[PDB]
Write a protein that binds this ligand. Structure first.
Ligand code: NAD
Ligand code: NAD
Ligand code: NAD
Ligand code: NAD
Ligand code: 572
Ligand code: 572
Ligand code: 572
Ligand code: 572
Ligand code: ZN
Ligand code: ZN
Ligand code: ZN
Ligand code: ZN
Lengths: 356, 356, 356, 356
């Protein structure tokens, strides 16, 4: 008998509350793609949401979908046209890869390309598996002093990078970050690395705020039932001035309203968090003071920068990882996520290397 | 006896529905001010609103206020430190003059200075009178080939310039202007002057839309009872694509919702029109497609540019003027404004020259 | 015998002074390419330079190269993955097509991609022939009201668009354009379409300046042996102020120096013209007044915009065409170019349609 | 007899090599000015240059001039219109104060105002004295946790802030700083504070480079006799790539040429150092790769930001101070500056407090 073939065990959502570990064929990379032996994949609230609800808005899992999109791995094989990567290279994977060079890609905002492929957003399969192929231009080599888990953390970190760029965060700024979930946390980390003088973070949880303090938050405000105007007043009271930039990472209407009231005239309110289809806000208050309201849709052009910041030790994302489980314990990892305790949970897909 | 002294008949609002023509003292210019013999003043919907309701939001006329803020005149006398203007100079008056060199002024956005002086916004008296003093830095000399009425039209034109700049309007753009009132009209003129390929204008009035066509609108859409989504669809149908920039000049919630649905991903929705304190909108739809929502608060750094466009005959605002009355017929002029027919009404304050 | 096959007569430079018309195989388009039946190709000074010198700087014709890069044509056949174009479509061809999605392409500046393919820049063959294949993302459909020659003129026009964008040209600006060759001319056209109040053009030739006046130049200055400071003084004397932007389209050292002296503090000097490897300039004078010096390397993201401006009749490039010859008379067309008389010369490659 | 009056001993340059300590009248603050009891003043190479040559370019000391412009002090008396400062307030002094609200001030670039007042640039007297009056808008209150010497260091630090802003320095950048003098050093500090991943510093002095390493330089290169191309090659070798931004702080032609060869295409070369009136450089090499060449003229809008970074301990400039002398030992201090050893020398003007 011939040698045993490798496997491609994958974490798949078939529908609401129907999560399974099953084997998939091993992908064959096209001329401009690379086949990766997956190593580390972080669990994102969105992967969990598809498992629980089978959809997010109008993005419905109509056929079984492999989960996972915050990842790193090792190049196993490269397509005939690939020259910048070779077998053995450790790489961080940027999940959104444009399918066509449309005007959004040409202008530098490929994240807005309508036909973009994106790991684990139906109907595109994610990378929580053993072997996964991806466009080579979107796999970036990791320096030796950057771990696989840091490589996987580049994905959420990039949301923070894109959000801060969209907000115009820069040297000396006072920034308000609403929400201390992983997104608010990486946003806090990025704001500080960019030179923000003070970053204030809000959240409903004292525990999450305590963690925010540990990683750099200068000020924190625990939210209970105060009004948006009251929160704005308290923030200003802590800073001694209004923040030039507010990055909204909760998606809650009251928080968006608070951001409008809190932001300094001429400043910027960045909307990262996802809320309802309709929202009631004091638009006039923002517009009349030229507080711009800018949304974020994932990110673009953040991997090389994230990699440089990690390699130079300019930012430390490691404290964000609270648990790590082998791929086979994915169900337990997802139930742990649901318990709300902990922060970033890593799934280790390579049996030969379960280390960070 | 001694020669008769000059008079300073002024148009004053004492409270809701209480408008009066009354004499004021002749102002004396400080070292950095000029005394102006007022010539032409355009009537703005806001002047009319203070007359009708005695307020706009929390800006209430608590003591009698002189109306008027879109104006031009002749330098009568200059303060000791004034060197760029001399008696006899014809000037356009920029109504917002900072009282202190705060951070907003230093950063180039003096329109956002909290303590700014602004003609006819309580408690600052306007310039619908015979003689008016103003900071010399904000009185701009008019070229001989630019009329007093064009000088007065620089004020509303500047709202259009500031809005197009804030919207990023540039060469080849498809622009949607919501509203065909004077503000939407100057926005249309500026958009075309800046190189917009196509400008679509919407409005409830077929008459105002016909006027829009006469001055440059490439496409017009009369709004009746369609929904925001339907209007957005019609606009895209007419343009063959989504406009990259939408400039909202109505302040109506339905129109703002239409702007969000109509604007191309990555584009900009500029809010000029004033609506209610609270607005219900598909915020998510804009944010998730990175459609920026930017407000406008009057303008900054637009007078020299407006003067250059008028002097070079690059834009024609003359068609906007539909009526002219001497200052003494201000009541008749305001009642005419209320009738709704016509567009820009000019008040002529200098008995020695009632021409354009 | 079978039907006669089509031909692909091409204009080829073998070396200095060695220009030939010869037949080439008919290209077969890949999945993402289209085969075009060439229609109109404008002659650029660079095509002429390769013919005369066999090189430009270190770009040497080491093997026979087909000339031509300012063109339009008709889609003859499309590759299996092409969906936005179909046989029969009239298209304008953007000559620079990136070979890889490197960081320059991802950031929106694909013109700087090191491995970019560019028609008629050795070793890449141009499009002065019957049939030519090209990446489909870089062939843009022309509206029915835009001619093939206007389609070909988009290439040089795009240099002007890119130059004006890099210069920050906008509403009300006073702009100085050095040089009245086709590049200075399209730059003048673009500056005016963008809202420049006044555009001053300089050149050694009175005839070229007369043409500049015909198409929109507000002021012109004929250059003889004046010093750079003297030219700067004269320009300022004509404008009554220093121009905010200067676009250098000659490549002559004295002109670059004049641009530094002429540009308003805080303004921008754009370098389009190609000069020597080393240049002596009053760098200090520019730096100390924050006059930025920005270069241009062809263009990026200009075709859709150029097409919208032509379709809306916002710019008229037709007057730039002074002669048109069928492909077979290319030698005569190039000798005519050398005579320096005339401006844009068009070569007509489609025997079935020799019209504009 | 009456109590002794205060004195205003000042350090004055009368001509080349003619420096004197002499008494001046006590200034009287106008309505919008404050009288300051000077505390700490850093010595700048320019103050020293006026002493040695009696001029810098065409800025010549035609009448005796008080030196000094990098300073902090205590508010002694305030003008009648001053409300944000009171006697006793510790303040950092921004030396450039516009005399008129011209277009440069209105647009947010007051540093370019032609008639600006600037301490110690003839004919404007500096602040190396006991009592000095200054426009109140340009005296900024220091937080209690920020020292007088840090307040004085805000001046050179601001050159670094303005240079990094002009260079577009941001998160993850690889930056080349040419020159390890105090200007290159503050530029290094700011670059790192803004998120630069790696900053390479060059200089002729190994001692200055050792100091650079101590405060944050990731890489250093001592320059001996290599050519500009060779240095550019070494820099790229060390970084493993070309720096996106180069900040030239030497003014040397060879260094500027090296910056052009070293900077990544699409990047920026910022010119801070002052060189000769004419410079020979590979302009083409920069222009054709769209490497922008941007100059710096001191700074604008940097004091509040600098104060926020110092107050938040985001940057440490203290290591820059190597010597301190009372005002009376100014001659000794200037001779020490000329010796070349050491970096920033502080002059202490307040006999009642000689501490940092
Ligand atoms: N637009 C994008 O491209 C993009 C990419 C990533 C994530 N997101 C979204 O960003 C949001 C943040 O995600 P995450 O993973 O950090 O989520 P999360 O659920 O872990 O964190 C959200 C936090 O908001 C806090 N919160 C809720 N209401 C609040 C209020 N009124 N005031 C203050 N704090 C409040 C919660 O206690 C929680 O800690 C989500 O809505 C996510 O879907 C958007
Ligand atoms: N933010 C600022 O700095 C600033 C400065 C000037 C004016 N404004 C505001 O801009 C707005 C426009 O002012 P104006 O003088 O042109 O006003 P206007 O009343 O003359 O014109 C408004 C136009 O909107 C049209 N309209 C109303 N609802 C509509 C809808 N749902 N769909 C389409 N069209 C609709 C009306 O028929 C009318 O022609 C006002 O709210 C004004 O107060 C703001
Ligand atoms: N960087 C790029 O991407 C790019 C793209 C297109 C063209 N170019 C270059 O731009 C330049 C313009 O090309 P073109 O086709 O219009 O060239 P051209 O030769 O037709 O025109 C150049 C003009 O400059 C004039 N001139 C020469 N010296 C002058 C001086 N001292 N003062 C004033 N006028 C002077 C000439 O009389 C002539 O009319 C060329 O150097 C070309 O190679 C650069
Ligand atoms: N434009 C402005 O607004 C502004 C404001 C401040 C200072 N400056 C200028 O910036 C420059 C730096 O000033 P500073 O106080 O730090 O000066 P400095 O003299 O103390 O430092 C200059 C450094 O350059 C080094 N150097 C000289 N030639 C070199 C070369 N070829 N390669 C590498 N290193 C070289 C010297 O060894 C020295 O350490 C000066 O020219 C100063 O006048 C400009
Ligand atoms: C369902 N989506 C496709 S969406 O367009 O409503 N939008 C949901 C929120 N988004 C999220 C959430 C979590 N992680 C990411 C990217 O890692 N994006 C960004 C995408
Ligand atoms: C009451 N105002 C002070 S306000 O801040 O609600 N806002 C109202 C709308 N604004 C208007 C309306 C008409 N004309 C102008 C300026 O000419 N501004 C701009 C100002
Ligand atoms: C030889 N070249 C490759 S180059 O890099 O020296 N540079 C030369 C001048 N350039 C020109 C000249 C004419 N037409 C074009 C583009 O149509 N580019 C831009 C390109
Ligand atoms: C003589 N000057 C007025 S100048 O315009 O040649 N230029 C010289 C260099 N400059 C310097 C040098 C040192 N310190 C400063 C500002 O603190 N500016 C900036 C000013
Ligand atoms: Zn995610
Ligand atoms: Zn108004
Ligand atoms: Zn060309
Ligand atoms: Zn200095």
């Amino acid at each position: 008998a011939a040698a045993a073939k490798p496997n491609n065990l994958s974490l798949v959502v078939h529908g609401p509350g129907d999560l399974r570990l099953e084997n998939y064929p091993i992908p064959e990379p096209g001329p401009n793609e690379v086949l990766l032996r997956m190593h580390s994949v972080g669990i994102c609230g969105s992967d969990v949401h598809y498992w629980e609800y089978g959809r997010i808005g109008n993005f419905i899992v109509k056929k079984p979908m492999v989960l996972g999109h915050e990842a790193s791995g090792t190049v196993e094989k490269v397509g005939s046209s690939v020259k910048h990567l070779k077998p053995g290279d450790r790489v961080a994977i940027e999940p959104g890869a444009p399918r066509e060079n449309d005007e959004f890609c040409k202008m530098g905002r490929y994240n807005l390309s309508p036909s973009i492929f994106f790991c684990a957003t139906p109907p595109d399969d994610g990378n929580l598996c053993r072997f996964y192929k991806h466009n080579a231009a979107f796999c970036y080599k990791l320096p030796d002093n950057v771990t696989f888990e840091e490589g996987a953390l580049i994905e959420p970190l990039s949301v923070g990078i894109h959000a801060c760029r969209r907000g115009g965060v820069t040297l000396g700024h006072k920034v308000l970050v609403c929400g201390a979930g992983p997104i608010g946390m990486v946003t806090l980390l990025v704001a500080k690395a960019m030179g923000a003088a003070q970053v204030v973070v809000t959240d409903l949880s004292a525990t999450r705020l305590s963690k925010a303090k540990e990683i750099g938050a200068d000020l924190v405000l625990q939210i209970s039932k105060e009004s948006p105007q009251e929160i704005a007043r308290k923030v200003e009271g802590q800073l001694g001035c209004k923040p030039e930039v507010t990055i909204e990472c909760t998606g809650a209407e009251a928080s968006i309203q608070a951001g409008i009231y809190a932001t300094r005239s001429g400043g910027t309110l960045v909307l990262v968090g996802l809320g309802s289809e309709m929202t009631t806000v004091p638009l006039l208050h923002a517009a009349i003071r030229e507080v711009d309201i800018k949304g974020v849709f994932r990110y673009c052009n953040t991997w090389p920068v994230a990699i440089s910041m990690l390699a130079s030790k300019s930012v430390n994302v490691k404290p964000l990882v609270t648990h790590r489980f082998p791929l086979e314990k994915a169900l337990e990892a997802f139930e742990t996520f649901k318990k709300g305790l902990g922060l970033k949970i890593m799934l280790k897909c390579d049996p030969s290397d379960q280390n960070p």
